[PDB]
Structure 1
């Protein structure tokens, strides 16, 4: 009913002679190699709407038919989307057939209204000790994850997905906003092996929906893919009534993509160069993540800080919404401590005694004090000496080092490649376990007894086993066996070990090859549309 009027990059103007589509409505272009969905951005006047494309606009002709769907982008929601990968417009990109849609919901939605909001403030118990003590997660909150590569972020993502599904009974949505496709495939395959995503007949036992908008998608497709993740998580909140986790992987790339679609729509950029609507592009997304009377959405969203500048307007606008930060560090990760949550850098707004209670608060406030006093004397130890300083300053060092060990925890999703079983640690067992290390009920136990254990009922059961070990090392003996001709051959006997490698001078470079004959004549189209050589003179 509408026809393409202008194609300027990712921005399409289409023209409706009848009634115009509403702003944010979805338009489908009739007859195109890929399904091209346009989202109406503004009404330009003279019966023209300006649209941002969710796919490539190459091959688009002025006057192509464009059908109004009468609604915004509508995506499949429900339990049938669990364990599936879905793109921004709702199509399966996991190559496993159609998505069993319980309903199809508009991805554009106002935030839950004031009466629908919950006036209460409470902890999302995660089963991770360092997260439940030192930086608790608000149910319905937004959590910044300051990880990276090799700090075990993905195994922390899958452990949050695991423990929220197991304890609180809520599902998860992973919205990968502008992610590399190599990394989005890595998360898909690691979710398959760790059990949080199942394929085939047991698809319904999955705990996570993956909603992917990759980096090679146009900036409109990446700017809306976090709202497709919201809409899947809002069905579980409002219809299923659950406590949903939502992972917006790189909320900065949400900002960055929305900043590109404002620049393509001809809007004057704001301070440092973001869109003028930066606080309402974020606040439109972040306010749908809340607690209602039905259920909750809690968002763990990864935060990139541009140019290591916290006062940049993209993190500064994001940090107004964030209720906790979990900083994953490499320094904690090379000490073998997993998860690599920095116990001092990680912050929470939920960590004040009017909302978690004073018996929880003073433990976390006391644990952080012990770790802080230990790490400001590390230019006292290396400069002067270990046995230099006082016995009380050594009492903290012994207490902090078995607190710094006790923040480690083995994960249930990591046990398929680590052997150590997973430990869900309850909240009361975390506080009461850390009261004791703070006072000194376990100063006699070794520090590596406090390592990769569940709670304080398992620190005693690790110091018992290690202490005995000296009773069971007099079982056998230990010296050299047959110095270097036991099974260590000669080097020229090892050259004849080497297997045959067939090296072809041929490349095998014409497997199934067309080899079209290309002529260097210039071929054009005449006015019939018939292909013809280029006419001779101008």
Structure 2
């Protein structure tokens, strides 16, 4: 046909301005191509600046861009290959395979920009997702068709937590899973890809029931922004056209907001609170609403929010809290004392913690665990200042029991054996609720609190207590 040629007029960091002629203006978020010596550069039209000039966001590095270079309009937004062909392949933001295994022979390439399915939702938030992690299986149950937050700052252990999530779930899940790796470590992605390869999760010459998306934080802001969108395109195509339950996996959903703020700083927008993009809520909602159960298929989301400067009140983590059925807040303070995973027991929360879905027994156990932990945190100040002696017998017993539960919350992970030094444990929901019910009644008050450290079920607690009392003492 007739190519739509545009001329580069401004290159502002990761943002490129393109000027067209009369009646050839690409719409917002259209994909634009420039034949750079290293390959092709994709530009997404962020704004129309008028006078037939469009403000665009770069999918790759803007070095080597000369003003006036020819710009080709693809005729639509960025299209990523979709279908079972992409399963087992590693794809960047653009859509080309980066797994060096040849081009993807996908029959369709759905655009990364799609409208939410509106009110095609279901209130099926009643199926507990058994992950094997005793703390989340007790305090903040995960939804099979819902969204999991998995908050945390630097360190804390969010990456090992999500990796344990894949290891326990995607191995024996009835459907496909998609990992996006939004602005994370490329070495982490390589290691986790190798880990799935060893487990047979991604079999190159086989079923390979998992599709991988990458474009980690080494990529420019536009990439880190749109890699979540392309992973969502993969997930939505598997969810609707294939009718399969999909295990989404986003290693850092915050990096999308970080990239949005980065491009907004160059988009000529007055900054929002804490210097974020003003549209942070709008783009964040547009991102999260593509992750919905929908009439056909279902999605599990599983996010991982990075809180800047360990500030839970930061605008992006505050905004993402609404778009999450269950959250798992990892606090660095708990990480200091060594209870791992560092999930905050009384900051994770889950909509699934209701007696109708839970069963009024596990719900009561979780409520009493929260009771003990909240009392412990309330009394920490006078415990440090005065000590345990000042408290009455009931308060002293409550503090000791809460310490025991908080130690018991630690659970070894199979993906963290090199760190713990102890083989990982997968605790069933019934096992952990029975164990914590037994703990709450005081049946294990005589057992030292250290026996609850890096253990699984209550039988493991008894075994560790016996070993410490006999072999160690």
TM-score clears 0.5? yes
> For the Cα contact (< 8 Å) 1:12–1:53, is it kept in 2?
no
3-state SS, counterpart of residue 300 of structure 1: coil
3-state SS, counterpart of residue 414 of structure 2: coil
Offset, 1:255: 1.9
More helix by share: 2
1:166 matched residue in structure 2: 171
Aligned partners of 2:335, 2:248: CA distance in 1, in Å? 25
1:469-520 residue CA offsets vs partner (Å, 9 max, x unmatched): 37xx9xxxxxxxxxxxxxxxxxxxxxxxxxxxxxxxxxxxxxxxxxxxxxxx
1:303-322 residue CA offsets vs partner (Å, 9 max, x unmatched): 34456665554343333323
> For the Cα contact (< 8 Å) 1:83–1:197, is it kept in 2?
no
Residue from 81, 103, 121 that aligns with 1:117: 121
3-state SS, counterpart of residue 115 of structure 2: coil
2:30 matched residue in structure 1: 25
Offset, 1:368: 1.2
Offset, 1:92: 3.4
CA-atom RMSD in angstroms: 3.4
Aligned partners of 1:39, 1:24: CA distance in 2, in Å? 5
2:238 matched residue in structure 1: 236
Residue from 191, 210, 214 that aligns with 1:211: 214
Q: With structure 2 as the length reference, what TM-score do the two structures score?
A: 0.84
Aligned partners of 1:308, 1:149: CA distance in 2, in Å? 7
Residue from 446, 458, 465 that aligns with 1:456: 458
Aligned partners of 1:380, 1:405: CA distance in 2, in Å? 21
Structure 1: runs of 5 or more not aligned:
474-538
Aligned partners of 1:20, 1:379: CA distance in 2, in Å? 63
Q: Does 1:253 align with 2:259?
A: no
Query: Which has the larger displacement, 126-135 or 442-451?
Result: 442-451
Structure 2: runs of 5 or more not aligned:
none
Query: Which has the larger displacement, 357-366 or 14-23?
Result: 14-23
How many pairs were matched up? Answer: 466
Aligned partners of 2:82, 2:100: CA distance in 1, in Å? 18
Query: Which has the larger displacement, 288-297 or 311-320?
Result: 311-320
Aligned partners of 1:151, 1:60: CA distance in 2, in Å? 40
1:13 matched residue in structure 2: 18
Decide which structure has the larger Cα Rg and report it. 1
1:136-179 residue CA offsets vs partner (Å, 9 max, x unmatched): 22344443333234422221111011122134334443333344
1:368-396 residue CA offsets vs partner (Å, 9 max, x unmatched): 11122234334444544545644433332
> For the Cα contact (< 8 Å) 1:192–1:198, is it kept in 2?
no
Aligned partners of 1:88, 1:208: CA distance in 2, in Å? 14
2:133 matched residue in structure 1: 128
Aligned partners of 1:41, 1:386: CA distance in 2, in Å? 60
Give the alignment of 1:369-388 within 5 angstroms: 369-386=371-388
> For the Cα contact (< 8 Å) 1:135–1:325, is it kept in 2?
yes
- 1:266 to 1:127, Cα distance in 2 relative to 1, 3 A: same
2:181 matched residue in structure 1: 176
> For the Cα contact (< 8 Å) 2:5–2:71, is it kept in 1?
yes
Q: Does 1:71 align with 2:76?
A: yes
Offset, 1:36: 0.7
Aligned partners of 1:416, 1:382: CA distance in 2, in Å? 34
Residue from 79, 87, 93 that aligns with 2:92: 87
> For the Cα contact (< 8 Å) 2:178–2:213, is it kept in 1?
yes
3-state SS, counterpart of residue 57 of structure 2: strand
